[PDB]
Amino acid sequence: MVEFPEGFVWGAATSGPQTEGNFHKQHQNVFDYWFATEPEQFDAGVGPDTASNFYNDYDHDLALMAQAGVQGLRTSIQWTRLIDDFETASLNADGVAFYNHVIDSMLAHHITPYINLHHFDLPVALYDKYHGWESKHVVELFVKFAEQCFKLFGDRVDHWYTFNEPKVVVDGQYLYGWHYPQVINGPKAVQVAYNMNLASAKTVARFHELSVRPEQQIGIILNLTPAYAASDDPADLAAAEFAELWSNNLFLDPAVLGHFPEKLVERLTMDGVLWDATPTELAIIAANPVDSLGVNYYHPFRVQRPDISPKSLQPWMPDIYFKEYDMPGRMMNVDRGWEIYPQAMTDIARNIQKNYGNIPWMISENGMGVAGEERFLDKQGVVQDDYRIDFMKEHLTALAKGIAAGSNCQGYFVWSGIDCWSWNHAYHNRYGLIRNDIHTQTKTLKKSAKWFAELGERNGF
Amino acid sequence: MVEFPEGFVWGAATSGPQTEGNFHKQHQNVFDYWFATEPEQFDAGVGPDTASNFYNDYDHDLALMAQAGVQGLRTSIQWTRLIDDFETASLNADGVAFYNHVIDSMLAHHITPYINLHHFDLPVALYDKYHGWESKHVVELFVKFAEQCFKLFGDRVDHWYTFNEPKVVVDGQYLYGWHYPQVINGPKAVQVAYNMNLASAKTVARFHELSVRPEQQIGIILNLTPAYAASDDPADLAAAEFAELWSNNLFLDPAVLGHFPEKLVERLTMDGVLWDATPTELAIIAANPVDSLGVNYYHPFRVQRPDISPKSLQPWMPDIYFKEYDMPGRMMNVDRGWEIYPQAMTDIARNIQKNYGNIPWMISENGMGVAGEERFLDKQGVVQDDYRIDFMKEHLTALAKGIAAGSNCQGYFVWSGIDCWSWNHAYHNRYGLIRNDIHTQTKTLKKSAKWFAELGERNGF
């Protein structure tokens, strides 16, 4: 009834910091330090130290993900586990052996690895020593870390990602206090956005120098949700224009087109907050675009005119040009406070098709979080998450409208395979196809897990 | 200047729970239990245990209402006072003796008795054992109770009411937390609204099985305030449409027309929350419409679209289809949060006239509550409540226009005669023509009282 291209990849996504636990990890990342420092900032004081126990139970967890129809698993390697000396990217042999075991175990369970290099997990010592992503020196050390990943694992991994959503690192570490170190500094944020874009192009350059097979590709993962204008009132449309240049073009254009959006550069220059670039850096960005795109979508995004004029005497923030808008009559997931609007998928598919060369791309994240799922256990122990299935039905149906009209979409990765630790929210919301009782680390497929499996075999629904 | 038809009843209204006190009352109703158990939920810690001392002082209390021009008095008999065993409706001899004394004292004072059977006072033991109005067994037990009242007092009581506003019991007990048990559950509310309509029809049948004089008639007291849309945008009149069906037609159509409003049942059906009804129950409802209508009006009712779509993921409530609206420029009773809009009574009179066969009806409640009436004591300790006299003239002016279009309105009852106990608000707001000083239980007539007595002696103002 609703079918998909031949060879479509049906996958799941997570990250290392949200699954492994900190068992025997040499270094603290910023979240590790934050929980060790301020456990009160974490739901029920549940931090990352055990997470979903993937460090100990990876082999059986991959078997369950295989039962749930996961053909490709996207996760990440932790900079703070793999590397001994950040300055030289010397190797921690127990961390090297651990990633070798999960990649081999993925292969034995017929799961194609999708390895991402960074998911919000900057080592805190590099923030102490250099202020982290503000340092073009840290940019080099990350490339050296990526180098080591490609040489150790490149023989078995075809699909790579530089970053999971650099924008969330910008927003979290430097604008709104979501990530330790919780800096509130707009101008610094602009430079960190530039530096991470430059880190990614440099990683793409290194990756292709060290390539061995043609099948090996490397991409980036971004949120590309449209910035819908509240109305056709010129202050609203102009707000949506900056919101999109800033929340999407900031990374899309360097990543795919190899340059920064011209109107955005103009705006930040006028406000005197523009990043420091060099022509050689800009040339490396121009010469090394990504090979593919991962798209994360959960909920739509609407903006209206700011309340006060952007010329007011206030610290510079991107938000001086736009304000979030709530649309009368929106379809809501009320407990989570999120609008449900599946066609945003279809708009994304059309944008990549028209404006970004129809570059090959996948939905790298899509999913629905629900609290207190114990309420929907049958006494056979299986969560009856019919809501998750309907959510996936609506969004896959809109994604199908995009593929049919010619969008080069190649895969759909659910967030997430197994319930995992959602930063300061920890396990308050569950996204998995598979349920984790985090007291015992005992995992059990939900109803949606069997549905996802049949979806992959039928390649539709 | 503003005159009324011949025979128009000028009366006053209260209830047993709000006047009697619990002196030697055998059983606890839901409010008694709530107060005995959470006194903090009631203004100044004042509960119903003494109320306005009507149990002890009914005789002199009645002599004063008669001085205030109360020609007929509506109040209620408490299920929890008259009945020994609820399962059989056996009699508590002291309760019977009390209500005989009250009724006989009314006629000795030439007040016509208007006796209502139920005013928010479900026995708490019937809730514990059966979940109260959710049980069709409890509906039968109420008919047994109603039958005893008819047999005991029908020899000198011509005018009866099955219920005072069952929608307030639905709303308070099962939707918004106003009444103990404070259940929040849309589906149950739907079933309780249906069950209470069924109890009233069953009571009407029993009443006419026993009625011997043609003067004997039984009615129901409803609030029929129109749902005024905020604007004529289609979303707001959709909201006003449902709010009308739900707040008025849900009770008025079964009571007067013999059937539930079809487009309401269609929407309750589509949403999966329809009550459980048998053919026999529906035929009883069709076959026993009430004889007359009691209308309570205090303030208008304005409605706009809901903030989110009724299809959002939320528990079913009637409120998913409409949100209240505050009209800019409203005339307000500021100390109370209530709009003043007397035209509404003209609209109700016309609705009843055109669309309900012009059934004999009365205003069973209308009044204004104000706090701290100590501030308007004159030199002889009489409240000078000109605000109350004005309020009456404006609403009587509107009623008289409805009658002049021919509407079959036959009387006007003010709330209230003596200041009585207003549930969780207790004695914060006073509505009476007669002030009650509650520490000593001394009642003195307000200035509005002498004005009410002249209005009846003249049929106008």
Short mmCIF file of N, CA and C in Angstrom, two decimals, chain B residues 55-183:
data_model
loop_
_atom_site.label_atom_id
_atom_site.label_comp_id
_atom_site.label_asym_id
_atom_site.label_seq_id
_atom_site.Cartn_x
_atom_site.Cartn_y
_atom_site.Cartn_z
N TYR B 55 -31.79 23.63 60.71
CA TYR B 55 -32.33 22.49 61.44
C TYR B 55 -32.98 22.94 62.74
N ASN B 56 -32.37 23.92 63.41
CA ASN B 56 -32.77 24.36 64.73
C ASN B 56 -33.73 25.55 64.70
N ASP B 57 -33.64 26.39 63.67
CA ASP B 57 -34.31 27.69 63.65
C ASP B 57 -35.25 27.86 62.46
N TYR B 58 -35.71 26.75 61.85
CA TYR B 58 -36.52 26.84 60.64
C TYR B 58 -37.74 27.74 60.83
N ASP B 59 -38.38 27.70 62.00
CA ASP B 59 -39.63 28.42 62.18
C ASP B 59 -39.43 29.93 62.06
N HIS B 60 -38.50 30.48 62.84
CA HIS B 60 -38.26 31.92 62.76
C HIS B 60 -37.58 32.30 61.45
N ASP B 61 -36.71 31.42 60.93
CA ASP B 61 -36.13 31.65 59.62
C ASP B 61 -37.21 31.83 58.56
N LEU B 62 -38.26 31.01 58.62
CA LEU B 62 -39.32 31.12 57.63
C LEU B 62 -40.13 32.39 57.83
N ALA B 63 -40.36 32.79 59.09
CA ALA B 63 -41.13 34.02 59.33
C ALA B 63 -40.43 35.23 58.73
N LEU B 64 -39.10 35.17 58.62
CA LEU B 64 -38.35 36.30 58.09
C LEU B 64 -38.35 36.31 56.56
N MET B 65 -38.26 35.13 55.94
CA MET B 65 -38.38 35.06 54.49
C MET B 65 -39.75 35.57 54.04
N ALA B 66 -40.80 35.19 54.77
CA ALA B 66 -42.13 35.71 54.48
C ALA B 66 -42.17 37.24 54.60
N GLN B 67 -41.46 37.80 55.59
CA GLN B 67 -41.37 39.26 55.68
C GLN B 67 -40.63 39.86 54.50
N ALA B 68 -39.73 39.10 53.87
CA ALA B 68 -38.99 39.57 52.72
C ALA B 68 -39.74 39.34 51.42
N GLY B 69 -40.98 38.84 51.49
CA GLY B 69 -41.77 38.62 50.30
C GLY B 69 -41.50 37.32 49.60
N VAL B 70 -41.05 36.30 50.33
CA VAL B 70 -40.90 34.96 49.77
C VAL B 70 -42.30 34.35 49.73
N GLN B 71 -42.90 34.31 48.53
CA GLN B 71 -44.22 33.70 48.37
C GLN B 71 -44.11 32.19 48.24
N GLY B 72 -43.10 31.72 47.51
CA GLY B 72 -42.77 30.32 47.48
C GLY B 72 -41.29 30.14 47.76
N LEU B 73 -40.97 29.02 48.40
CA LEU B 73 -39.60 28.72 48.79
C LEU B 73 -39.21 27.38 48.18
N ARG B 74 -38.14 27.37 47.41
CA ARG B 74 -37.59 26.12 46.93
C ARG B 74 -36.41 25.72 47.79
N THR B 75 -36.40 24.47 48.23
CA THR B 75 -35.22 23.90 48.88
C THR B 75 -35.24 22.40 48.62
N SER B 76 -34.38 21.66 49.32
CA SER B 76 -34.22 20.25 49.00
C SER B 76 -34.27 19.39 50.26
N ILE B 77 -34.74 18.17 50.07
CA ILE B 77 -34.68 17.12 51.08
C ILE B 77 -33.42 16.31 50.85
N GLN B 78 -32.67 16.05 51.92
CA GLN B 78 -31.42 15.31 51.82
C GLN B 78 -31.67 13.81 51.95
N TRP B 79 -31.31 13.08 50.90
CA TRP B 79 -31.21 11.63 50.90
C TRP B 79 -30.54 11.12 52.18
N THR B 80 -29.44 11.77 52.58
CA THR B 80 -28.66 11.36 53.74
C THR B 80 -29.34 11.70 55.07
N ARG B 81 -30.45 12.42 55.06
CA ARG B 81 -31.18 12.70 56.29
C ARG B 81 -32.44 11.86 56.43
N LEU B 82 -33.17 11.65 55.33
CA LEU B 82 -34.48 11.02 55.41
C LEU B 82 -34.39 9.51 55.49
N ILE B 83 -33.34 8.91 54.91
CA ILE B 83 -33.29 7.46 54.67
C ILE B 83 -32.44 6.78 55.74
N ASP B 84 -32.97 5.70 56.32
CA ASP B 84 -32.16 4.85 57.17
C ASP B 84 -31.29 3.94 56.29
N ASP B 85 -31.87 2.89 55.68
CA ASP B 85 -31.11 1.98 54.82
C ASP B 85 -31.35 2.33 53.35
N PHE B 86 -30.26 2.68 52.65
CA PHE B 86 -30.36 3.12 51.26
C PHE B 86 -30.91 2.02 50.35
N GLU B 87 -30.57 0.76 50.61
CA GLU B 87 -30.97 -0.33 49.70
C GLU B 87 -32.49 -0.48 49.63
N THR B 88 -33.19 -0.19 50.73
CA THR B 88 -34.64 -0.33 50.80
C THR B 88 -35.38 0.98 50.96
N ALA B 89 -34.67 2.10 51.15
CA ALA B 89 -35.30 3.39 51.41
C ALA B 89 -36.18 3.35 52.66
N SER B 90 -35.79 2.55 53.66
CA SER B 90 -36.48 2.63 54.94
C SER B 90 -36.22 4.01 55.57
N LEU B 91 -37.08 4.38 56.52
CA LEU B 91 -37.17 5.77 56.95
C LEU B 91 -36.47 6.00 58.28
N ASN B 92 -35.80 7.14 58.37
CA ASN B 92 -35.29 7.68 59.63
C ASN B 92 -36.37 8.57 60.22
N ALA B 93 -36.94 8.14 61.35
CA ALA B 93 -38.14 8.80 61.88
C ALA B 93 -37.89 10.27 62.21
N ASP B 94 -36.69 10.59 62.72
CA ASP B 94 -36.39 11.98 63.06
C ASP B 94 -36.24 12.85 61.81
N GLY B 95 -35.63 12.31 60.76
CA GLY B 95 -35.60 13.03 59.49
C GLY B 95 -36.99 13.33 58.95
N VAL B 96 -37.86 12.31 58.89
CA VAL B 96 -39.25 12.50 58.47
C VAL B 96 -39.91 13.58 59.32
N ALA B 97 -39.73 13.50 60.64
CA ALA B 97 -40.34 14.48 61.53
C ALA B 97 -39.82 15.89 61.23
N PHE B 98 -38.53 16.02 60.90
CA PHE B 98 -37.98 17.33 60.59
C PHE B 98 -38.63 17.92 59.34
N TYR B 99 -38.75 17.12 58.28
CA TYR B 99 -39.24 17.67 57.03
C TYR B 99 -40.73 17.95 57.07
N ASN B 100 -41.50 17.12 57.78
CA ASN B 100 -42.88 17.48 58.09
C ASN B 100 -42.95 18.83 58.81
N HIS B 101 -42.11 19.03 59.83
CA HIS B 101 -42.11 20.31 60.56
C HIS B 101 -41.79 21.48 59.64
N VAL B 102 -40.76 21.33 58.80
CA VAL B 102 -40.40 22.41 57.87
C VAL B 102 -41.55 22.71 56.93
N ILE B 103 -42.09 21.67 56.27
CA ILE B 103 -43.15 21.90 55.29
C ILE B 103 -44.37 22.51 55.96
N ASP B 104 -44.76 21.97 57.12
CA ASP B 104 -45.93 22.52 57.81
C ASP B 104 -45.69 23.96 58.24
N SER B 105 -44.45 24.31 58.59
CA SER B 105 -44.16 25.67 59.03
C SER B 105 -44.20 26.63 57.85
N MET B 106 -43.81 26.15 56.66
CA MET B 106 -43.92 26.97 55.45
C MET B 106 -45.37 27.36 55.20
N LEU B 107 -46.28 26.38 55.28
CA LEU B 107 -47.67 26.68 55.00
C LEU B 107 -48.30 27.53 56.09
N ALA B 108 -47.89 27.34 57.35
CA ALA B 108 -48.33 28.24 58.41
C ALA B 108 -47.89 29.68 58.14
N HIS B 109 -46.77 29.86 57.46
CA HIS B 109 -46.29 31.17 57.06
C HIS B 109 -46.71 31.55 55.64
N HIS B 110 -47.60 30.78 55.02
CA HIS B 110 -48.12 31.10 53.69
C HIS B 110 -47.01 31.22 52.65
N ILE B 111 -46.02 30.35 52.75
CA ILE B 111 -45.04 30.14 51.69
C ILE B 111 -45.43 28.86 50.97
N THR B 112 -45.54 28.92 49.65
CA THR B 112 -45.80 27.71 48.89
C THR B 112 -44.53 26.87 48.81
N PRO B 113 -44.59 25.56 49.07
CA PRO B 113 -43.38 24.73 49.02
C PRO B 113 -43.03 24.27 47.61
N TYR B 114 -41.78 24.48 47.22
CA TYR B 114 -41.21 23.92 46.00
C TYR B 114 -40.06 23.01 46.43
N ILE B 115 -40.26 21.69 46.34
CA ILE B 115 -39.33 20.73 46.93
C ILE B 115 -38.53 20.03 45.83
N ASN B 116 -37.21 20.19 45.89
CA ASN B 116 -36.26 19.55 44.99
C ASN B 116 -35.65 18.34 45.69
N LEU B 117 -35.41 17.27 44.94
CA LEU B 117 -34.95 16.02 45.53
C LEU B 117 -33.43 15.88 45.66
N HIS B 118 -32.62 16.60 44.87
CA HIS B 118 -31.19 16.34 44.92
C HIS B 118 -30.38 17.57 44.54
N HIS B 119 -29.45 17.95 45.43
CA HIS B 119 -28.63 19.16 45.25
C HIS B 119 -27.19 18.80 45.66
N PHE B 120 -26.48 18.12 44.76
CA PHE B 120 -25.07 17.75 44.88
C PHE B 120 -24.78 16.85 46.08
N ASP B 121 -25.79 16.20 46.65
CA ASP B 121 -25.57 15.56 47.94
C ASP B 121 -25.68 14.04 47.91
N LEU B 122 -24.95 13.40 47.00
CA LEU B 122 -24.86 11.95 46.96
C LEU B 122 -24.35 11.41 48.30
N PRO B 123 -24.99 10.40 48.88
CA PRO B 123 -24.41 9.70 50.04
C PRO B 123 -23.02 9.14 49.73
N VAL B 124 -22.06 9.45 50.61
CA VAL B 124 -20.70 9.01 50.35
C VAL B 124 -20.61 7.49 50.41
N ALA B 125 -21.47 6.84 51.20
CA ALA B 125 -21.44 5.38 51.25
C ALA B 125 -21.84 4.77 49.91
N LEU B 126 -22.71 5.44 49.15
CA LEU B 126 -23.04 4.92 47.83
C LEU B 126 -21.89 5.10 46.84
N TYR B 127 -21.03 6.10 47.07
CA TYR B 127 -19.83 6.20 46.24
C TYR B 127 -18.85 5.09 46.59
N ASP B 128 -18.56 4.90 47.89
CA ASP B 128 -17.59 3.89 48.29
C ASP B 128 -17.99 2.52 47.77
N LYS B 129 -19.28 2.17 47.90
CA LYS B 129 -19.76 0.84 47.56
C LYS B 129 -20.01 0.64 46.06
N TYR B 130 -20.44 1.67 45.32
CA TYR B 130 -20.89 1.46 43.95
C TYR B 130 -20.28 2.41 42.94
N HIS B 131 -19.48 3.39 43.39
CA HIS B 131 -19.08 4.55 42.60
C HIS B 131 -20.27 5.43 42.21
N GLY B 132 -21.24 5.54 43.12
CA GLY B 132 -22.20 6.63 43.06
C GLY B 132 -23.01 6.65 41.78
N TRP B 133 -23.03 7.81 41.11
CA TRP B 133 -23.85 8.02 39.92
C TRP B 133 -23.37 7.23 38.71
N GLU B 134 -22.22 6.55 38.81
CA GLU B 134 -21.79 5.65 37.75
C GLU B 134 -22.60 4.36 37.73
N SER B 135 -23.33 4.07 38.81
CA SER B 135 -24.03 2.81 38.98
C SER B 135 -25.52 3.00 38.71
N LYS B 136 -26.04 2.21 37.77
CA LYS B 136 -27.48 2.17 37.56
C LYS B 136 -28.24 1.54 38.72
N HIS B 137 -27.56 0.77 39.59
CA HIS B 137 -28.20 0.37 40.84
C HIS B 137 -28.48 1.58 41.73
N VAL B 138 -27.50 2.48 41.85
CA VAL B 138 -27.71 3.70 42.63
C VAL B 138 -28.85 4.52 42.04
N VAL B 139 -29.00 4.51 40.71
CA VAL B 139 -30.10 5.23 40.09
C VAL B 139 -31.44 4.69 40.60
N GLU B 140 -31.56 3.36 40.74
CA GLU B 140 -32.78 2.76 41.29
C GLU B 140 -32.98 3.16 42.75
N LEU B 141 -31.89 3.21 43.53
CA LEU B 141 -32.02 3.54 44.94
C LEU B 141 -32.50 4.97 45.13
N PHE B 142 -32.14 5.86 44.20
CA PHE B 142 -32.64 7.22 44.23
C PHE B 142 -34.14 7.26 43.93
N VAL B 143 -34.61 6.39 43.03
CA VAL B 143 -36.05 6.38 42.76
C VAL B 143 -36.81 5.90 43.99
N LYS B 144 -36.27 4.90 44.69
CA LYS B 144 -36.88 4.46 45.94
C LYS B 144 -36.97 5.61 46.92
N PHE B 145 -35.87 6.36 47.06
CA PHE B 145 -35.86 7.55 47.91
C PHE B 145 -36.92 8.54 47.46
N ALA B 146 -36.97 8.83 46.16
CA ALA B 146 -37.92 9.80 45.63
C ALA B 146 -39.35 9.36 45.90
N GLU B 147 -39.61 8.05 45.82
CA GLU B 147 -40.95 7.54 46.08
C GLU B 147 -41.38 7.80 47.52
N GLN B 148 -40.46 7.64 48.47
CA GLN B 148 -40.81 7.90 49.87
C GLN B 148 -41.16 9.37 50.09
N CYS B 149 -40.43 10.28 49.44
CA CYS B 149 -40.75 11.70 49.57
C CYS B 149 -42.14 12.00 49.03
N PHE B 150 -42.49 11.40 47.89
CA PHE B 150 -43.81 11.61 47.31
C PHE B 150 -44.90 11.10 48.25
N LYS B 151 -44.69 9.91 48.82
CA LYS B 151 -45.72 9.33 49.66
C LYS B 151 -45.85 10.07 50.97
N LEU B 152 -44.73 10.63 51.47
CA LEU B 152 -44.74 11.27 52.77
C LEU B 152 -45.24 12.71 52.71
N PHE B 153 -44.97 13.43 51.62
CA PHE B 153 -45.22 14.86 51.59
C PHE B 153 -46.07 15.32 50.43
N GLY B 154 -46.43 14.42 49.51
CA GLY B 154 -47.24 14.77 48.37
C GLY B 154 -48.64 15.21 48.73
N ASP B 155 -49.05 15.01 49.99
CA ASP B 155 -50.37 15.50 50.39
C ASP B 155 -50.41 17.02 50.48
N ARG B 156 -49.28 17.69 50.68
CA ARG B 156 -49.35 19.15 50.71
C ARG B 156 -48.16 19.81 50.01
N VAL B 157 -47.56 19.13 49.03
CA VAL B 157 -46.54 19.70 48.15
C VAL B 157 -46.93 19.42 46.71
N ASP B 158 -47.27 20.47 45.96
CA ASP B 158 -47.67 20.36 44.56
C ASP B 158 -46.50 20.41 43.57
N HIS B 159 -45.41 21.12 43.90
CA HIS B 159 -44.35 21.43 42.95
C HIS B 159 -43.06 20.72 43.34
N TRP B 160 -42.52 19.92 42.42
CA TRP B 160 -41.34 19.10 42.70
C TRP B 160 -40.28 19.27 41.62
N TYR B 161 -39.03 18.97 42.01
CA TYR B 161 -37.89 18.92 41.11
C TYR B 161 -37.12 17.63 41.34
N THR B 162 -36.72 16.99 40.24
CA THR B 162 -35.90 15.79 40.38
C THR B 162 -34.49 16.15 40.83
N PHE B 163 -33.85 17.10 40.14
CA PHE B 163 -32.47 17.48 40.37
C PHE B 163 -32.32 18.98 40.21
N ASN B 164 -31.37 19.55 40.95
CA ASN B 164 -30.85 20.89 40.69
C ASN B 164 -29.56 20.73 39.90
N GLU B 165 -29.59 21.07 38.60
CA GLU B 165 -28.42 21.09 37.72
C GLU B 165 -27.55 19.84 37.82
N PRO B 166 -27.99 18.70 37.27
CA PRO B 166 -27.10 17.52 37.25
C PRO B 166 -25.75 17.77 36.57
N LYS B 167 -25.68 18.69 35.60
CA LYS B 167 -24.39 18.98 34.96
C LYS B 167 -23.33 19.43 35.96
N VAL B 168 -23.73 20.08 37.06
CA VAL B 168 -22.74 20.49 38.05
C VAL B 168 -22.21 19.28 38.80
N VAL B 169 -23.02 18.23 38.93
CA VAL B 169 -22.54 17.01 39.55
C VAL B 169 -21.58 16.27 38.62
N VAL B 170 -21.94 16.18 37.33
CA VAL B 170 -21.04 15.64 36.33
C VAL B 170 -19.73 16.41 36.33
N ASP B 171 -19.82 17.73 36.16
CA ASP B 171 -18.62 18.56 36.08
C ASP B 171 -17.78 18.43 37.35
N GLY B 172 -18.41 18.57 38.52
CA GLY B 172 -17.66 18.66 39.76
C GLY B 172 -17.11 17.32 40.21
N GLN B 173 -17.90 16.26 40.06
CA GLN B 173 -17.44 14.97 40.54
C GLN B 173 -16.50 14.30 39.57
N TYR B 174 -16.62 14.56 38.25
CA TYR B 174 -15.92 13.72 37.29
C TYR B 174 -15.08 14.44 36.24
N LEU B 175 -14.97 15.77 36.28
CA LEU B 175 -14.18 16.43 35.25
C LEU B 175 -13.18 17.45 35.78
N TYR B 176 -13.60 18.32 36.70
CA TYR B 176 -12.77 19.47 37.05
C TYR B 176 -12.41 19.55 38.53
N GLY B 177 -12.67 18.49 39.30
CA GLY B 177 -12.23 18.49 40.69
C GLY B 177 -13.04 19.33 41.66
N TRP B 178 -14.23 19.82 41.28
CA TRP B 178 -14.98 20.71 42.17
C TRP B 178 -15.64 19.97 43.32
N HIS B 179 -16.12 18.74 43.08
CA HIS B 179 -16.79 17.93 44.10
C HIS B 179 -15.98 16.68 44.42
N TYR B 180 -15.83 16.39 45.71
CA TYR B 180 -15.42 15.06 46.12
C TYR B 180 -16.39 14.12 45.42
N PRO B 181 -15.91 12.99 44.87
CA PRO B 181 -14.61 12.29 44.85
C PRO B 181 -13.47 12.92 44.01
N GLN B 182 -13.68 14.05 43.33
CA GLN B 182 -12.63 14.69 42.51
C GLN B 182 -12.00 13.72 41.51
N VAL B 183 -12.84 13.00 40.76
CA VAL B 183 -12.36 12.14 39.69
C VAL B 183 -12.18 12.99 38.43
#
